[PDB]
């Protein structure tokens, strides 16, 4: 602390950040692949059907939460 000025100057010559960021951040903020594929207006009804709950699953959920 007697001559900490020049010492800190040289220390910054050779920025304090959290340890989780100084682990060689090679790929900083990787660019995500832009995906604006919208189709015409939708895709299909197969996904609608795969989202809809089957009667078997409905009855099973009712039995479980009875």
């Amino acid at each position: 602390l007697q001559h900490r000025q020049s010492l800190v100057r040289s220390a910054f010559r050779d920025l304090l950040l959290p340890p989780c960021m100084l682990k060689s951040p090679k790929r900083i903020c990787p660019v995500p692949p832009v995906s604006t594929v919208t189709g015409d207006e939708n895709i299909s009804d197969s996904e609608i059907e795969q989202y809809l709950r089957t009667p078997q699953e409905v009855r099973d959920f009712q039995r479980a939460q009875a």
Binding site: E57, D60, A64
Partner: protein, 111 residues
């Protein structure tokens, strides 16, 4: 009258005190087989956390929700595969698997 039922505590320094901001949650982490059976439960039910918490007695519904959000943010392909695959709801075999997981965690604690 309190017949030496409690012990005086020499706390609360009148000088000053600081803050904590973190009190209760203190969750418990998962494991590989537990993540596997959790993905199985997802594929078997969906996203309704009520049924998932009902079928998981030993893990909290809030922890299950946090895990699902973490998986949605990190591993999307796995969630997609889980939703692609489907399994009819099994109750007795699921209770048997719950007993198996209880035995496994007991063995872990023994280790």
């Amino acid at each position: 009258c309190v017949v030496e039922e409690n012990d005086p505590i020499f706390e609360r320094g009148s000088t000053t005190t600081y803050s904590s901001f973190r009190k209760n949650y203190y969750s418990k982490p998962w494991s590989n087989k537990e993540t596997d059976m959790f993905f199985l439960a997802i594929s078997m039910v969906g996203t309704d956390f009520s049924m998932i918490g009902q079928l998981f007695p030993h893990r909290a519904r809030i922890e299950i929700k946090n895990k699902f959000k973490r998986e949605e943010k990190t591993n999307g392909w796995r969630i997609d595969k889980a939703f692609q695959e489907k399994r009819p709801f099994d109750f007795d075999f699921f209770a048997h698997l719950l007993q198996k997981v209880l035995a496994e965690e007991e063995k872990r604690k023994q280790k």
